[PDB]
PDB file of C-alpha atoms in Angstrom:
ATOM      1  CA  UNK A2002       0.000   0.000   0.000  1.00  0.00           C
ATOM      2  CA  UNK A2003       2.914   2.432   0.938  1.00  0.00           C
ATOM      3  CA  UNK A2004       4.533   1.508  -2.263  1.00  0.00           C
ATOM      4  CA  UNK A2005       7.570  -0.287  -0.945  1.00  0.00           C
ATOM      5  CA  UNK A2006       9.579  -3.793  -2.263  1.00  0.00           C
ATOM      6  CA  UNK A2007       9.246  -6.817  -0.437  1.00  0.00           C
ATOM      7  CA  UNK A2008      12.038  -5.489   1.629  1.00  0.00           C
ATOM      8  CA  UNK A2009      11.189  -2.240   2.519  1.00  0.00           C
ATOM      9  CA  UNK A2010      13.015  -0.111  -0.229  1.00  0.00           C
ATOM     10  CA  UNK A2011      10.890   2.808  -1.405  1.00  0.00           C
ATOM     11  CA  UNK A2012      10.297   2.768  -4.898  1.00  0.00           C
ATOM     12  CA  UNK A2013       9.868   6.567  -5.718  1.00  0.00           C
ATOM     13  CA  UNK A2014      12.969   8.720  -5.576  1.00  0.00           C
ATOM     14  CA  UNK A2015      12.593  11.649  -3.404  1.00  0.00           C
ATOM     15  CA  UNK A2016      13.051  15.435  -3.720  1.00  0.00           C
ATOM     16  CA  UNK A2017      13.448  18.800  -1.465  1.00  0.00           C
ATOM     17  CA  UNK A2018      14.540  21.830  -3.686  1.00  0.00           C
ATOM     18  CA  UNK A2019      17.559  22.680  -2.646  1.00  0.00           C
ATOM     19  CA  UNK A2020      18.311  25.782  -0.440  1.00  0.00           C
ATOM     20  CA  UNK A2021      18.410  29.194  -2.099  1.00  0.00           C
ATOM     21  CA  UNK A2022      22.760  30.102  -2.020  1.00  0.00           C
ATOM     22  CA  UNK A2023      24.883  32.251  -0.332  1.00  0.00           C
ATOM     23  CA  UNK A2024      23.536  35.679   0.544  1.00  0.00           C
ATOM     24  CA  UNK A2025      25.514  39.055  -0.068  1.00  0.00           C
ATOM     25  CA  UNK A2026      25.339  41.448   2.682  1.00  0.00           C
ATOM     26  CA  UNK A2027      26.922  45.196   2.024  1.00  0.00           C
ATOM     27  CA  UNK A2028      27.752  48.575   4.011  1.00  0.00           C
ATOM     28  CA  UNK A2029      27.647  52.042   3.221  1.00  0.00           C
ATOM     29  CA  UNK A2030      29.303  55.178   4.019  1.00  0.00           C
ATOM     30  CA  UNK A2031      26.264  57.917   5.319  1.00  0.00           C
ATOM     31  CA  UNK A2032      26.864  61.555   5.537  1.00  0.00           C
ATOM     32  CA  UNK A2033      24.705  64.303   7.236  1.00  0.00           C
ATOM     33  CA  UNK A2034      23.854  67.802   6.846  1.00  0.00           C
ATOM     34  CA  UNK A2035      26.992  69.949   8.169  1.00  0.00           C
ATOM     35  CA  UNK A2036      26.688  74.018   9.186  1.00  0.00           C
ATOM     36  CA  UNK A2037      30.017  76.175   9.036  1.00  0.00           C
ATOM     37  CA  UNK A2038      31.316  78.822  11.350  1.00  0.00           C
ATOM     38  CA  UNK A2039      29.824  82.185  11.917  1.00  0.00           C
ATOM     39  CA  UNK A2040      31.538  85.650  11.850  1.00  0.00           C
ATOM     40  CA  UNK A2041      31.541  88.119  14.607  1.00  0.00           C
ATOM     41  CA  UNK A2042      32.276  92.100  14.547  1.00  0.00           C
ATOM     42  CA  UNK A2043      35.957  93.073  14.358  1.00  0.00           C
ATOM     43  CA  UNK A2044      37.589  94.832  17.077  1.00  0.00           C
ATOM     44  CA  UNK A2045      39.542  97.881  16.102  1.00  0.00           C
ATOM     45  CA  UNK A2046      43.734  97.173  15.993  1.00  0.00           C
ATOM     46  CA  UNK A2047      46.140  99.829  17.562  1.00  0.00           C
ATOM     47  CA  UNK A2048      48.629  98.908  14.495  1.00  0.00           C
ATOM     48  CA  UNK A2049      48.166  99.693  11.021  1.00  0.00           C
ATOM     49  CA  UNK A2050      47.481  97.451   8.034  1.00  0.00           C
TER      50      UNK A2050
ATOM     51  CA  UNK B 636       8.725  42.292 -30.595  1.00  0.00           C
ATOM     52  CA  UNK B 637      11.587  40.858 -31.770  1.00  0.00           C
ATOM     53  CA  UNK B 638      13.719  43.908 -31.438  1.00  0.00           C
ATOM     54  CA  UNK B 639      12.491  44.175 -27.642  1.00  0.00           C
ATOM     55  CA  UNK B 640      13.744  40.111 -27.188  1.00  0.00           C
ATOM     56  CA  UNK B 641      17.193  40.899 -28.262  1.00  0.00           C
ATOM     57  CA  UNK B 642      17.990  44.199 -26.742  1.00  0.00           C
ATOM     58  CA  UNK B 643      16.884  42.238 -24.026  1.00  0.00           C
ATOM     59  CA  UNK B 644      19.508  39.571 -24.434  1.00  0.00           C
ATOM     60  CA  UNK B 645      22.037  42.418 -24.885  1.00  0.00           C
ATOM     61  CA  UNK B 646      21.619  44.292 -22.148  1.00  0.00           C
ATOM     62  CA  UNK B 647      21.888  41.177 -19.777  1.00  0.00           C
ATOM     63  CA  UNK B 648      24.682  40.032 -21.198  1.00  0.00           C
ATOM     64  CA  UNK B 649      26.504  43.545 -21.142  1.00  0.00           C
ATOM     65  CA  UNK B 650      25.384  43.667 -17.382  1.00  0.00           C
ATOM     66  CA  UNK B 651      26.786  40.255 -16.797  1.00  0.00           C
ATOM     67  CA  UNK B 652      30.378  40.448 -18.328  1.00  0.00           C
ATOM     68  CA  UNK B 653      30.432  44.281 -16.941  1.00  0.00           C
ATOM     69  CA  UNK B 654      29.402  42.751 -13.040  1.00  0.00           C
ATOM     70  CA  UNK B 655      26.989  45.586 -13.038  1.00  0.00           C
ATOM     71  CA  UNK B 656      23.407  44.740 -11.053  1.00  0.00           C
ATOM     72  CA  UNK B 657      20.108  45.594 -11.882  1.00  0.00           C
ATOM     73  CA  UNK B 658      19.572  47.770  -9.438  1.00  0.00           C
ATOM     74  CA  UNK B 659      23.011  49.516  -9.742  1.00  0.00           C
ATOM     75  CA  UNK B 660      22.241  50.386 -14.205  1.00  0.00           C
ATOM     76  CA  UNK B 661      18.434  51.840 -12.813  1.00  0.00           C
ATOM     77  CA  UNK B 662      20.185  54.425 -10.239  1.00  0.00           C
ATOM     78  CA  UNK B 663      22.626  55.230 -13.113  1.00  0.00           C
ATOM     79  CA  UNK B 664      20.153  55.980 -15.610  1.00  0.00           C
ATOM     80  CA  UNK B 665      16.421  56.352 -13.404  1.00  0.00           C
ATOM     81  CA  UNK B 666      14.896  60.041 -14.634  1.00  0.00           C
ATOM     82  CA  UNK B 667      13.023  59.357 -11.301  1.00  0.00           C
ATOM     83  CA  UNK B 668      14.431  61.245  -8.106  1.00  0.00           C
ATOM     84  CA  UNK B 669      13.688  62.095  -4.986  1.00  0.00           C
ATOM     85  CA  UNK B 670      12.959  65.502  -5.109  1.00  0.00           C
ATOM     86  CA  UNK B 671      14.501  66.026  -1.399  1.00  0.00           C
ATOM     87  CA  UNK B 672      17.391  68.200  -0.907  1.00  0.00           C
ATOM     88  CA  UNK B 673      20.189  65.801   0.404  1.00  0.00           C
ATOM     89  CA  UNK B 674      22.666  66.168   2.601  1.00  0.00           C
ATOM     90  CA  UNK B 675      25.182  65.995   0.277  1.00  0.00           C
ATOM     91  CA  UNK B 676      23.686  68.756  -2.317  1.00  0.00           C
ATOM     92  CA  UNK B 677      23.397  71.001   1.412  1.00  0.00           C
ATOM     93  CA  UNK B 678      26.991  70.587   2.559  1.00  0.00           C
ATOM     94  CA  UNK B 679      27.699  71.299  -1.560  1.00  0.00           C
ATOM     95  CA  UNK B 680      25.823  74.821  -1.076  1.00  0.00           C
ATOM     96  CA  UNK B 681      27.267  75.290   2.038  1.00  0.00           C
ATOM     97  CA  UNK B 682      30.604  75.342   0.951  1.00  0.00           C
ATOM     98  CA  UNK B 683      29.718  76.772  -2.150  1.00  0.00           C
ATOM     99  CA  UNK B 684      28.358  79.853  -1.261  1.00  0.00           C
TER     100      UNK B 684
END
């Protein structure tokens, strides 16, 4: 009924789709928004230019 | 409809031999964008200016 031999061999060969391969895992560089220095008033020097 | 099967075929097989993925030839050439200014177009104008 469970279509095996006399001695228990089965008689269908079996299958199980083999696992999907590797997997490729990357990194990246990520920047953000940057501000810059402000300017003040300038004092007045004692020496010339 | 021929024409569209073998550009087809080309274009895979120039992505292939030139190790280039799919998603890496649709940022190169994508008219779509994200319409945000990025960080790296601010810190451009920021140095820029």
């Amino acid at each position: 009924r469970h279509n095996l031999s006399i001695d228990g061999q089965p008689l269908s060969l079996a299958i199980y789709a083999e696992p999907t391969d590797p997997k490729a895992l990357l990194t990246s560089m990520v920047q953000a928004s940057q501000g810059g220095s402000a300017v003040l008033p300038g004092t007045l020097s004692l020496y010339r230019f | 409809l021929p024409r569209l099967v073998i550009w087809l075929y080309q274009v895979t097989q120039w992505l292939t031999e030139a190790e280039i993925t799919t998603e890496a030839i649709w940022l190169l050439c994508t008219p779509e964008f994200s319409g945000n200014i990025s960080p790296e177009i601010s810190n451009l104008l920021n140095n820029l200016r």
